[PDB]
Amino acid sequence: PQEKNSLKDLVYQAFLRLGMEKTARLLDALKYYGFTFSTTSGITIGIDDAVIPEEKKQYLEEADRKLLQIEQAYEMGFLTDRERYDQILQLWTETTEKVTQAVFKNFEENYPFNPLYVMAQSGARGNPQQIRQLCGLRGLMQKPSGETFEVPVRSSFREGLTVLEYFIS
Amino acid sequence: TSVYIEDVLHEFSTIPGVKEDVVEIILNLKELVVRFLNPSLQTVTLLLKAEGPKEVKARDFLPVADVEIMNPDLHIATLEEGGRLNMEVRVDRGVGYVPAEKHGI
Amino acid sequence: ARTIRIPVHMVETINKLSRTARQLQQELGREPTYEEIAEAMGPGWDAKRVEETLKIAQEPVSLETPIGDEKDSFYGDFIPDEHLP
Amino acid sequence: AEPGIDKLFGMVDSKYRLTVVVAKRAQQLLRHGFKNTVLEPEERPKMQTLEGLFDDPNAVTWAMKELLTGRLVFGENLVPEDRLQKEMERLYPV
Amino acid sequence: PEWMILEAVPVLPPDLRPMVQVDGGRFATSDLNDLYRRLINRNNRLKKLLAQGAPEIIIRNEKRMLQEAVDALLDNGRRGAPVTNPGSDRPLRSLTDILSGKQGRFRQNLLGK
Amino acid sequence: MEIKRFGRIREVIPLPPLTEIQVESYRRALQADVPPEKRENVGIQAAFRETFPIEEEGLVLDFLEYRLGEPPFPQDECREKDLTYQAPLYARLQLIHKDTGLIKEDEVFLGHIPLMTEDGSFIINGADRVIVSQIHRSPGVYFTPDPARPGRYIASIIPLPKRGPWIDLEVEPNGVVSMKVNKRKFPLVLLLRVLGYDQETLARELGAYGELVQGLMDESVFAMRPEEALIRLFTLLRPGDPPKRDKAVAYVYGLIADPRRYDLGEAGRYKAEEKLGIRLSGRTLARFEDGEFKDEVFLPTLRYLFALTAGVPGHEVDDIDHLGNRRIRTVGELMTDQFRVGLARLARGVRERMLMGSEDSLTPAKLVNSRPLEAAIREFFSRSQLSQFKDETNPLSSLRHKRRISALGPGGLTRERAGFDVRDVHRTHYGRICPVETPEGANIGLITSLAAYARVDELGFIRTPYRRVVGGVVTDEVVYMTATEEDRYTIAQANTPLEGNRIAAERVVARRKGEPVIVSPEEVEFMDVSPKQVFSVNTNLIPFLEHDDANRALMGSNMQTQAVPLIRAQAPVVMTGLEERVVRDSLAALYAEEDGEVAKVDGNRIVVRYEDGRLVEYPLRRFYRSNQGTALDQRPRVVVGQRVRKGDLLADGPASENGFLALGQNVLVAIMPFDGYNFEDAIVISEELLKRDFYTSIHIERYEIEARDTKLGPERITRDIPHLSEAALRDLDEEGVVRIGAEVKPGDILVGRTSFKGESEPTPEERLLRSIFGEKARDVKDTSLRVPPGEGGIVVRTVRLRRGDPGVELKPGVREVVRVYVAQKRKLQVGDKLANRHGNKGVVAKILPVEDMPHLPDGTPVDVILNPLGVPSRMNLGQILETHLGLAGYFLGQRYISPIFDGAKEPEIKELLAQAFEVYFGKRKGEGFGVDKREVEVLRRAEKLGLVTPGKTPEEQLKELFLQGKVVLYDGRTGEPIEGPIVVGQMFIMKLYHMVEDKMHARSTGPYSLITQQPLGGKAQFGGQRFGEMEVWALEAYGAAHTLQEMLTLKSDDIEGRNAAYEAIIKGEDVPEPSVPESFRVLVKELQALALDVQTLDEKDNPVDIFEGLASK
DNA sequence: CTTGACAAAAGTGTTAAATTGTGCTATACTGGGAGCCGTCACGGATGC
């Protein structure tokens, strides 16, 4: 499939073999057909296009269970205050990455022509980090001092943030 | 295509005894539907002379031969006691959308 | 004290006019008009002379006066040269 | 892109030499009213005007197309500047 | 090396420090004229003080004021409190200020136009 | 059209008056209505009581009372005549002869106090202005840790701004505590000796904190008396100054003990007592009584500093960005502060007049010169950074401006001193300052907005309301409480589930000192009133705010301020519930004072017969020009004989629809790329918008000209302009002014003016030319006012103010001034900026005919085409949800109120879409139409994309697409359907004040600068574009040497070159070789003025003259 | 082509009022005034 990198390599190869004048004509041809097909393709953005994977609920419940494990070990003296803080951040960092993989795995196997997935894969608009905030969770937030809040933003932009989460972000 | 109102110089004014300003009256006149019963008729002028208190409608224009108002109940202006509305509305025949800045009639 | 020098006889005239206007303001509770100032000055004074004297007393404005909240725009940037063709 | 821009760049060692040659030729063409052109009458650049097809007024367009034909000679220290101007006026009094 | 001390102070041409009447009727002038007037007033007063045989304390104060007037004309605010026109706290734009900075002559009128 | 309201949170209290930050503070400062004997010691009353009595000593000028008179002119007349809406100020002053014992009392006129209008603004020189509230560090005593020395703390004593020096107490590494005053560091031990402290006393009070008291032990200064230490202290503070006792005591008294010179402030005094656990008698660091200095705050400050350094419990450092440590100076305090400064200047002039003498016939009127007070007040309302030209593009614009909070301004911060700490959203901004509304760019975090429910208290601290929670049940008791008081409680979120008034959820999301925690209901002590208190008014107008990224929500809230009023302005289909309150609190609309019946309705005025029987006539503001040029008019919304209740709408104001805020239009939007005209935020609209006059706005431009007295003769405003034909003078009346109702185009004359030509002999070519034609040159020339390029319209108003007119204060030498108002009706065109409330903005790049737009199967074309590529990166999903809800409301014929964070959710939007489908598609079935062949093809692709369930009927699959907000959409160009279903819905889009009509500019040649001889700048001055250094860099990188040289010389400041270039071009010739720029000649001459010999040399080092021999003697 | 003739138009020498510059006020008076410090790192010098 013709994406940003393959089209860029095509333009560079045409420049080497054919010169500026022919490359400029090729660029206008790509622009014309790219605009023509994007209009008739049926590319739009609905709220359901931000598909929520079913693994997000599993990961959040799993993260909550391991969050209790950290707090249980905190009360037993096995780990210090800074150890508890680092353990929570690592747990949510790993959970955030798994949700990102679940979002794109859900698109890859079930909605290969999903608008957000197609824009991100083709290089038109968006990156996996921004797609995760729309379909997964926004994740950990930082205080103005630079310290990370212990509780992440568990909601995506589809579900809608709470008042506190919006202020934390 | 053009409207003349007595004692009115431009469309950015208000008329004493009339609730609507000239802009709103022109907006109401843009919804006037006029049917020419004569295929050779190209331009007609409709005369309206009203005195308050009344709700002047499209049926209050003076009758013109080979001219029929298709929406007589169209609201034009609201006249208060002591208010008068003497209008000369010109209706032309044409195609497409011609902004006033182009024809300038 | 003035970039455009004014003779002492006219400086004292400006000082007297300013004092007279100040005293009339406290009596009237408002800015006096040129006729009211001229009447208080005495004989030989009309509103035309008061206006001319006040026009004379106007100090020149600086070309480097800032315009806006940033010191990047000045009065001289908006004055066209009208001498060179 | 300008017509034959790849060929124009290939005829000079430095791309800015091409601009100097084109600009100097254009002023030669403007100075003599395009009477010093090396273009054949069927090769003259044309303007589509409401009054008909006329010659292209842009001398830069003329200069670029003249260089594509190969009938122009460019270089450094080809002829003295004074002798070049005087001789070209003799051939094209304009 | 003694040329680093000024005996004659150059005066900028008047069109580069214009006094112009605006369309309204009021006059507009550059800060350099006020800086020049202060130097001339202090220099002229020193000449009269010297002619009157004033005590050294008065002469010393005038000479120190003359040095500061020259400094304000060349570089206002470089040494001591910046010189400002009456009725405002704006420092007068000196010759150094005109040439230096982002609003100076180099970066506002020579490197870009 | 019904309005369906979403939301579960019940707001116990309504929004406070949105302008009370302006209105209440200025009323408190003026105290105009309270009788003088009951005036409290605040505002300008406090200013009088602080400066008076002016005891020169023996004449004493005492202040008894002041009063404010009625304004000389009404608000409308002040605007027309460029007058300040102000009230005369009179002070009843008494002069007391201490020797004779005689009192002379009279009322002196102190000048004019500008008056705030009802909406909360001022009219300064005929212009509407808003005084922006200022945020700064609150006065008091603060304890911050030393960054250089770990474990060490410094004590800061901050008074009111420009009301005393900052005091720093620090334990030096050697041990002695140092006091830093006016950049001078001296040992604090010496000061306490002056303030009467013994060695035993210091050991008793502060000897219980380690050995730190040992550093507060200098045997040299305890040996000397307090009077000797006072002189010793005076020498350190003012070295060289003769240390006389009377001079020394006056300096120390004026440094820490003079109320007229040191003022800790009511907020500062309160903060000092709360932190140090003491009780201040006044607002000074010390008190001078019985000929000696008594300490008031230094001992508690040093005691806390040692206790904090010793690590004792209960002592903590102070967060200076904590909003309990940052206060707001409102318009009342800012005006009062400048009023005090002017009064101090007036008091100083009273003393010198008392020094002059003539006490035999001295009256208080003679001693008082009000000009220093008037000048200070005039300077504050005219040339202050916080005094700003009122933004009134739409009524919401003025509301936001009056709630703006600025960290800049006099006594404020600068962007150089503004680090990340001041600009960040502190945790205490919650409920007090909006975490979203801020200007993006260099001013981010420096200008903010008051939160919707927030209010500034008497001390200047922002308080936010909370609901008291006791025993796990939420009461209706609302407590407005500061950030420092908020830190003491566990405050639950407003979304916490409630069973009646009792908290139903076992786990409650709460905040403890700003941190999110999960607590039991019994641990909850307060509750948030509503989600709306977190955000400002503009942010609260963004529906589905919870679905938008904060960076794009910032853009949406800011651009609502830029929306122009529309002649057919509509309230949004999806609202948040604050649209009515914004219009009501802006005072732009008209409402019935009480119950009554409307007697007369007209476009000019409304007369209502109230129940009590009195006739009240309300004149309607019609076609008024705002500060930004947008037309502000009030259109009546009642008929004659209609009964109105108290508060019922009488006339809609600008940008309002039936009392609801109407900043734009409701248009049918298709979210889909369209042939590259949607590229990079560009917007495609239909021509049908122009046909029905949506996004059509009225703009009024003001043109001014003055007829002046000139030495060669006065300028005459007349119709007789020399050398002009009848065509050019056709629209001018006999007075020379353009007639009302005339259409004016660029180059047309608005008003004719002739000016006497300066005496100068003509060029000989002109002398021969005039002689051939036999025409004698006239004495006057054309100086008439003409329409600038790219402007024009319809003349609607001409204002002529003449010298001697009542209230017209023309400048000397000006005989008359003529002002012409030109109104233009602006339709939407290519280049005009459109935006929605979610930060999606773009310019119209293409206007299509109706038959080219995508259309529904029922034939309805969409109005606006938006690129779906603008959504994913911006992460503002609220527009999509608005589009889905708008699609349901478009077919159900209803509007929606979805409050932010508590409103319409996806399940409830979809069930609205299910009902909207039954009228969307069920109407088709009744008309005798099945499923389109084109729809069947799209449904076939839809199931391959996983959008519809395979095996269902086409009707069911179309319903499934509809529940996702998508419809089958047909291409108007081809008739074939778009291969995939397209999100189509109704969305509220605003037309912004940035219009290509006002921004397009071009210049070939024009005015040049006086000194540099370079083209001026700005479209208004017909200036040229700035070719700065970076643009010069670009040409250098291109190797375009000759292009660069032209811009440097031929097109900017080569006077000979630019004249020869223009002459060559108009002759058909090529421009000549450029020459030296005139700015380089200026540079050389200015370098010579610095006594620098700058010379241009040739190949042979010989001097080269670039001045053409014009400067060589 | 000159040559008179005119009524200005322009130059010019007085004379007056208007304007401008200068001196002078005699109880005794004897060291100012406004500020008043929320940024940062960078050289470079200037001395402990």
UniProtKB/TrEMBL annotation, chain C:
Sites where the protein binds Mg(2+) 3: A38, G42
Residues at which Mg(2+) 6 binds: G42
Annotated residues for binding of Mg(2+) 10: D72
Binding positions for Mg(2+) 7 per the UniProt entry: G42, W45
Domain of life: Bacteria
Subcellular location, record wording: Cytoplasm
UniProt binding sites for Mg(2+) 9: D69
Annotated positions binding Mg(2+) 8: W45
Residues the entry annotates as binding Mg(2+) 5: A38, W45
Binding site for Mg(2+) 4: A38, G42, W45
Free-text function comment from the UniProt entry: Sigma factors are initiation factors that promote the attachment of RNA polymerase to specific initiation sites and are then released. This sigma factor is the primary sigma factor during exponential growth.
Family label: Belongs to the sigma-70 factor family. RpoD/SigA subfamily.
Protein name: RNA polymerase sigma factor SigA
Region of the whole protein represented: 255 to 339 of 423
